[PDB]
Amino acid sequence: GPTGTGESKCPLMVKVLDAVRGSPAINVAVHVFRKAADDTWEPFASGKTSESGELHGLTTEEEFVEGIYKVEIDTKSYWKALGISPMHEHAEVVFTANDSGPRRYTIAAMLSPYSYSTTAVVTNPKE
């Protein structure tokens, strides 16, 4: 997919990559939800990202909605797996349809840095 059509295929896909190097993140806990008629968060999908920045299995008929989706990523367990430096606050994606005018339906999440530590040094949790 060279220059030209810089868009996705599926109706809803999750894209998680480490801004540290710009590469995709592997084994990244992700949970997708939808805006319920009661103004609540309903379960839309869930799983772990891939080295291709895509997550298969989350796709469902639920995608046939207004467009409101809430994807949450858990980096706390992502840095504990690869022993990566600590973060500040997980990144989430919450957008509503019929608001402004969205184009792509892919969730772009970058695990940007949040400290000075560079060298990959394994560390223990808060406990």
54 annotated binding-site participant: yes
117 annotated binding-site participant: yes
The encoded tokens of residue 69 equal 């989706």
Distance (Å, rounded) from C-alpha 98 to C-alpha 48? 29
Distance (Å, rounded) from C-alpha 26 to C-alpha 24? 7
Question: 111, exposed or middle or buried, with CB in 10 Å at 0-12, 13-18, 19+?
Answer: buried
Binding residues for L-thyroxine: 15, 54, 117
Binding residues: 15, 54, 117
